[PDB]
């Protein structure tokens, strides 16, 4: 840096557009020794950059991806360089305007620290630190990395302002979807021959409600099966998502049945109406912030019971389609409806069959039915072993990891939902004029030492 | 529960109250078998479990009975012609029997609409089977981390 | 303890059973390790390390 022939430009990038700070982040192995000296060099360079260049700060220079060194440390999953940039308080008094941690007032036992929300909550900027902590970083250390000092309180800021509001809208917006469906059900003409001529304007009004009700079930149906291939118990516990799925299944079944021409759609249609008002009983919990261990369990409960239903129904269709292929003489195209009807009844135990006479081939019907029990009994035990093989070893750690992760994940998805006008309204942090003014955040402390 | 059910039934006018009345009498002398333990002072882990067992099975019964009343009251509303005021007693009687599996029904003929009756009954199993697993997950999601 | 023991054991158990399955001709093809001429040459294996001590 200081020489007599030619100096070294600290601001110089590379072919990757990275400066001297970014290489320090890239080698910052989260160990004992390596987290030590990188904090020493990081303080050394920036002060030297200000002393040689008072106009520009070294943190300001971005990359080919427009990344600060603080922005980069979230990507590569670095902690030691991360917790030092956040806890940045420089004694040099010339590189002071870029310091991060401050001391407001020190009335005895109570310290008033002050962290800047410079890049943590980018209101009208491109991309934030906190967004990369949640949306982009795939490193395991993101559970620890959210447990740094300001972000544990920064996430509690916007949770207190947006959590109670966004939850109450979700309760009302579900009630809107129910009252629409009540007006559909009780105002049906009910002749016995569905569908209907949709020419009456006062019947055209309730016609619009089927667009609202059905497509809401369709969106919930196709996104979750995509989310399976590719349980937010904060608001509503994970038992609701399975139950609202069963609500979603019965709607699209209902939509078929009056388009086939069978007038018995009315039983299923009011059936889901009973559940939907009784699904509202999960709204009475309020809001949950303390993580239990059953939260990770109920994802796998939803993961495999949906697999349990599809392995059921494909087997019932497949074995019914199998038995049609045995029929070499003509057989009839209406037999497959009668195979499948007589096949569902055996699993329940109705005994109201139409084709299969168990008195005809008894020694075969039993040994298929006995093995059908054994197939189903093991798939039930695959549920319990997958739960017992989960609640033992590392559930003591991960259930307090994803719960912290999902709590941070949802509140930023709420943050993306608001427009740019309402974004500036409930913004945390205050303007505190320090130096020779910024949007920093007030943090309280209590300490009985340091006298 | 069986006492207040008993008190209704001889005020309705139905003389079959006597079965339920002596039924709870058998339990009450057999409930005295929990008196033989003595007194417990050492805490086990099942004590916090049995609150949630009582917390949710009471919820499990009310989510049952409100669903049975609600679906029965639903099917009366399908009846646009006159229907009769005594049909709701016959919907609800023929609806309890399906969950047990008596098959002694009076109105609902499964031979009439078989492809609908099955897929409602299959989904009724799936509704009940998940609510049973909500018991076990709430117990397994309790006896691991901080129950110690 | 044991679930992270037999899982390590069975992971090693199966890959040697795969190794017994190939003939002697295909055995030499995907052989790990390299010839590094050391001394006054052998089939050794390269291992990386990272250490900030030892200066």
Interface partners of chain C (CB pairs < 8 Å, 3 or more) are A
Nearest by CB: B137 against A249, A268, A298: A298
Residue A61: exposure state from Cβ atoms within 10 A (0-12, 13-18, ≥19): buried
C-alpha distances (whole Å) from A204 to each of A22, A189, A273, A342, A403 are 63, 12, 21, 40, 46
Resolution of the solved structure (Å): 6.5
Q: Which residues pair with A116 in a beta bridge?
A: A440
Q: How many CB atoms lie within 10 A of CB C18?
A: 8
Collapsing DSSP states into helix, strand and coil, what is residue A10? Answer: coil
Instruction: Compute the residue count for chain C.
Output: 55
N- to C-terminal Cα separation, chain B: 35
The residues, any chain, with a CB within 8 Å of residue A301's CB and separated by 6 or more, are A238, A242, A383, A387, B130, B133, B137
Collapsing DSSP states into helix, strand and coil, what is residue A102? Answer: strand
Confirm or reject contact between A31 and chain C (CB < 8 A): yes
Instruction: Compute the residue count for chain A.
Output: 451
Confirm or reject contact between C55 and chain A (CB < 8 A): no
Distance CA A33, CA C52 (A): 7
Residues of A in contact with C53 (CB under 8 A): 33
Residues of A in contact with B70 (CB under 8 A): 274, 277-278
Distance CA A127, CA A66 (A): 9
Mutate to test the interface with A, among C2, C49, C52 (most CBs of A within 10 A): C52
* Helices B17-30 and B2-12, packing angle to 10 deg: 160
Q: After which residues is chain B broken (C to N over 2.5 A)?
A: 82
Per the listing, tokens 């209902």 go with: A254
The residues, any chain, with a CB within 8 Å of residue A170's CB and separated by 6 or more, are A235, A236
Handedness of CA A40, A45, A46, A50 (dihedral sign): positive
User: Do the chains contact at C53 and A33, CB–CB below 8 Å?
Assistant: yes
Longest dimension (CA), chain A: 106
Q: How far out from the chain centre does Cα A335 lie?
A: 46
Q: After which residues is chain A broken (C to N over 2.5 A)?
A: 230, 330, 436
Q: Which residues pair with A142 in a beta bridge?
A: none
Q: Which residues of A31-44 are buried (b: 16+ CB within 10 A; e: fewer)?
A: eeebbeebbeebbe
Distance CA B144, CA A392 (A): 7
CB A218 within 8 Å of CB A245: no
The residues, any chain, with a CB within 8 Å of residue A67's CB and separated by 6 or more, are A22, A75
Closest CA to A296 of B47, B145, B60: B145
Distance CA A71, CA A62 (A): 9
Distance CA B5, CA A185 (A): 34
Question: Do you find a cis peptide bond into A406, omega within 30 degrees of 0?
Answer: no
Distance CA A135, CA A211 (A): 33
Distance CA A268, CA A254 (A): 6
* Helices A265-278 and B114-140, packing angle to 10 deg: 20
C-alpha distances (whole Å) from A234 to each of A128, A221, A248, C21 are 24, 21, 21, 52
The CA distance from C4 to the nearest CA of chain A, in Å, is: 10
Residues of B in contact with A294 (CB under 8 A): 137-138, 140-142
Longest dimension (CA), chain C: 48
Residues of B in contact with A295 (CB under 8 A): 141
Closest CA to B124 of A268, A191, A196: A268
User: Do the chains contact at A266 and B78, CB–CB below 8 Å?
Assistant: yes
Mutate to test the interface with C, among A30, A34, A386 (most CBs of C within 10 A): A34
In terms of phi and psi (left: phi > 0; alpha: psi -120 to 50; beta: otherwise), the region of A190 is: left
The CA distance from A192 to the nearest CA of chain B, in Å, is: 11
Pairs from A128-137 (Cβ < 8 Å, separation ≥ 24): A129/A70, A129/A71, A129/A74, A130/A154, A130/A408, A130/A412, A131/A412, A132/A71, A132/A74, A132/A75, A133/A74, A133/A408, A134/A405, A134/A408, A134/A409, A134/A412, A135/A412, A136/A74, A136/A75, A137/A74, A137/A75, A137/A77
Helix (H) or strand (E) holding A174, with range, is helix A149-185
In terms of phi and psi (left: phi > 0; alpha: psi -120 to 50; beta: otherwise), the region of C39 is: left
Residues of B in contact with A266 (CB under 8 A): 78
Residue A149: exposure state from Cβ atoms within 10 A (0-12, 13-18, ≥19): middle
Confirm or reject contact between B141 and chain A (CB < 8 A): yes
Helix (H) or strand (E) holding A39, with range, is helix A34-52
Q: Which residue of B has its CA nearest to A381?
A: B133
Q: What is the dihedral of CA B75, B77, B79, B80, to 10 degrees?
A: -160
Distance CA A322, CA A336 (A): 10
Collapsing DSSP states into helix, strand and coil, what is residue B45? Answer: coil
Q: Which residues pair with A431 in a beta bridge?
A: A439
Helices (H) and strands (E) in chain A, counts: 16, 4
Confirm or reject contact between C3 and chain A (CB < 8 A): yes
Count of alpha carbons within 13 Å of A283, Cβ hemisphere only?
Answer: 16
Confirm or reject contact between B114 and chain A (CB < 8 A): yes
User: Do the chains contact at A34 and C53, CB–CB below 8 Å?
Assistant: no
Confirm or reject contact between B122 and chain A (CB < 8 A): yes
Helix (H) or strand (E) holding A243, with range, is helix A239-260
Residues of B in contact with A399 (CB under 8 A): 145
**What 3 state SS string does A373-422 have?**
HHHHHHHHHHHHHHHHCCCCCCHHHHCCCHHHHHHHHHHHHHHHHCCHHH
Pairs from A131-138 (Cβ < 8 Å, separation ≥ 24): A131/A412, A132/A71, A132/A74, A132/A75, A133/A74, A133/A408, A134/A405, A134/A408, A134/A409, A134/A412, A135/A412, A136/A74, A136/A75, A137/A74, A137/A75, A137/A77
Residues of A in contact with B143 (CB under 8 A): 391
Question: Beta strand pairing status for C42-44 and A430-432?
Answer: unpaired
Q: What is the dihedral of CA B123, B125, B130, B132, to 10 degrees?
A: 160
Say which experimental method was used. Answer: X-ray
Distance CA A195, CA A189 (A): 10
The CA distance from A42 to the nearest CA of chain B, in Å, is: 40
Q: Which residues pair with A113 in a beta bridge?
A: A103, A443
The CA distance from A204 to the nearest CA of chain B, in Å, is: 21
Instruction: Compute the residue count for chain B.
Output: 148
Whether A and B touch, i.e. at least 3 CB pairs below 8 A, reads as yes
Residue A141: exposure state from Cβ atoms within 10 A (0-12, 13-18, ≥19): middle
* Helices A294-326 and A239-260, packing angle to 10 deg: 30
Pairs from A49-58 (Cβ < 8 Å, separation ≥ 24): A49/A10, A49/A11, A49/A95, A50/A92, A50/A94, A50/A95, A50/A98, A51/A94, A51/A95, A52/A1, A52/A10, A53/A11, A54/A94, A56/A11, A57/A95, A57/A98, A58/A10, A58/A11, A58/A19, A58/A20, A58/A21
DSSP E strands, A280-363 = none
Distance CA C50, CA C55 (A): 13
Q: What are phi and psi of A442, to 5 degrees?
A: -85, 130
In degrees, to the nearest 5, what angle opens at C-alpha A165 toward C-alphas A162 and A170? Answer: 115
Closest CA to A1 of A48, A43, A55: A48
Distance CA A317, CA C55 (A): 71
Residues of B in contact with A293 (CB under 8 A): 140-142, 144-145
Residues of A in contact with B61 (CB under 8 A): none
Q: Which two tokens stand for residue B84?
A: 């009769």
In degrees, to the nearest 5, what angle opens at C-alpha A153 toward C-alphas A151 and A434? Answer: 85
A-C contacts (CB, under 8 Å)? 9
The residues, any chain, with a CB within 8 Å of residue A299's CB and separated by 6 or more, are A231, A238
The CA distance from B15 to the nearest CA of chain A, in Å, is: 33
Q: After which residues is chain C broken (C to N over 2.5 A)?
A: 40
User: Do the chains contact at A262 and B116, CB–CB below 8 Å?
Assistant: yes
Q: How many CB atoms lie within 10 A of CB B88?
A: 16
Closest CA to A170 of A228, A101, A251, A232: A232
Q: Which residue of A has its CA nearest to C54?
A: A33
Mutate to test the interface with A, among B62, B66, B92, B130 (most CBs of A within 10 A): B130
User: Do the chains contact at C3 and A393, CB–CB below 8 Å?
Assistant: yes
Distance CA A111, CA A444 (A): 6
Helix (H) or strand (E) holding A293, with range, is none
CB B98 within 8 Å of CB B105: yes
C-alpha distances (whole Å) from A334 to each of A355, A369, A426 are 12, 25, 63
Q: How many CB atoms lie within 10 A of CB C4?
A: 9
User: Do the chains contact at A249 and B67, CB–CB below 8 Å?
Assistant: no
In degrees, to the nearest 5, what angle opens at C-alpha A399 toward C-alphas A394 and A400? Answer: 110
User: Do the chains contact at C3 and A29, CB–CB below 8 Å?
Assistant: no
Nearest by CB: B145 against A305, A337, A396: A396
The residues, any chain, with a CB within 8 Å of residue B141's CB and separated by 6 or more, are A292, A293, A294, A295, A297, A391
Whether A and C touch, i.e. at least 3 CB pairs below 8 A, reads as yes
Q: How many CB atoms lie within 10 A of CB A106?
A: 13
Helix (H) or strand (E) holding B7, with range, is helix B2-12
Q: Which residue of A has its CA nearest to B133?
A: A301
**What 3 state SS string does A134-163 have?**
HHHCCCCCHHHHCCCHHHHHHHHHHHHHHH
The residues, any chain, with a CB within 8 Å of residue A247's CB and separated by 6 or more, are A217, A272, A275, A276, A279
CB A149 within 8 Å of CB A443: yes
Nearest by CB: C50 against A29, A37, A393: A29
Pairs from C34-42 (Cβ < 8 Å, separation ≥ 24): none
Distance CA A306, CA A301 (A): 8
């Amino acid at each position: 840096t200081e020489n007599a022939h030619k100096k070294a430009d600290i601001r110089r990038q590379d072919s990757r557009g990275n400066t001297v700070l970014h290489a320090l982040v890239a080698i910052a192995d989260n160990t004992r020794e390596n987290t030590k000296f990188v904090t020493k060099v990081y303080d050394l360079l920036v002060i030297k950059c200000v002393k040689l260049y008072p106009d520009s700060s070294l943190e300001a220079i971005f990359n080919n991806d427009s990344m600060s060194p603080l922005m980069m440390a979230a990507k590569l999953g670095k902690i030691g360089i991360f917790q030092h940039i956040i806890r940045l308080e420089i004694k040099d008094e010339e590189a002071r305007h870029l310091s991060r941690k401050f001391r407001d007032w020190a009335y005895g036992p109570v310290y008033s620290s002050l962290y800047d929300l410079s890049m943590l909550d980018t209101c009208g900027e491109e991309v934030s630190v906190l967004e990369i902590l949640v949306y982009n970083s795939k490193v395991e250390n993101r559970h620890e990395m959210l447990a740094v000092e300001p972000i544990n309180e920064l996430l509690r800021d916007k949770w207190q302002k947006f959590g109670a509001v966004s939850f109450y809208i979700s309760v009302v917006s579900y009630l809107i979807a129910m009252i629409i469906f009540t007006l559909i059900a009780y105002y049906r003409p009910m002749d016995g021959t569905p569908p209907y001529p949709y020419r009456t304007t006062m019947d055209y009004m309730r016609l619009a409600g089927e667009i609202v009700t059905l497509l809401t079930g369709v969106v919930f149906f196709i996104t979750n099966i995509k989310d399976l291939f590719m349980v937010n118990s904060l608001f509503i516990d994970g038992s609701f998502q399975l139950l609202y799925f069963i609500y979603s299944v019965l709607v699209i079944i209902t939509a078929v049945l009056y388009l086939v021409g069978i007038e018995s759609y009315l039983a299923v249609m009011v059936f889901a109406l009973v559940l939907g008002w009784m699904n509202a009983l999960y709204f009475t919990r309020g809001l949950k912030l303390t993580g239990t261990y059953s939260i990770m369990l109920q994802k796998i409960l939803f993961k495999d019971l949906f697999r349990f239903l599809l392995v059921y129904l494909l087997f019932m269709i497949g074995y019914a389609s199998a038995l049609v292929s045995l029929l070499n003489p003509c057989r009839d195209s209406s037999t497959f409806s009668k195979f499948l009807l007589d096949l569902f009844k055996l699993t329940i135990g109705m005994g109201d069959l139409e084709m299969i006479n168990s008195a005809k081939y008894p020694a075969v019907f039993i040994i298929l039915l006995v093995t059908y029990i054994i197939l189903t009994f093991v798939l039930l035990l695959n549920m319990l072993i997958a739960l017992m093989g989960e609640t033992v070893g590392q559930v003591s750690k991960e259930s307090k990891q994803i719960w912290k992760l999902q709590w941070a994940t949802t509140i930023l998805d709420i943050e993306r939902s608001f427009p740019v006008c309402m974004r500036k309204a409930f913004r945390s942090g205050e303007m505190v004029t320090v130096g020779k003014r910024r949007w920093c955040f007030r943090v309280d402390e209590v300490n009985w030492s340091h006298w």
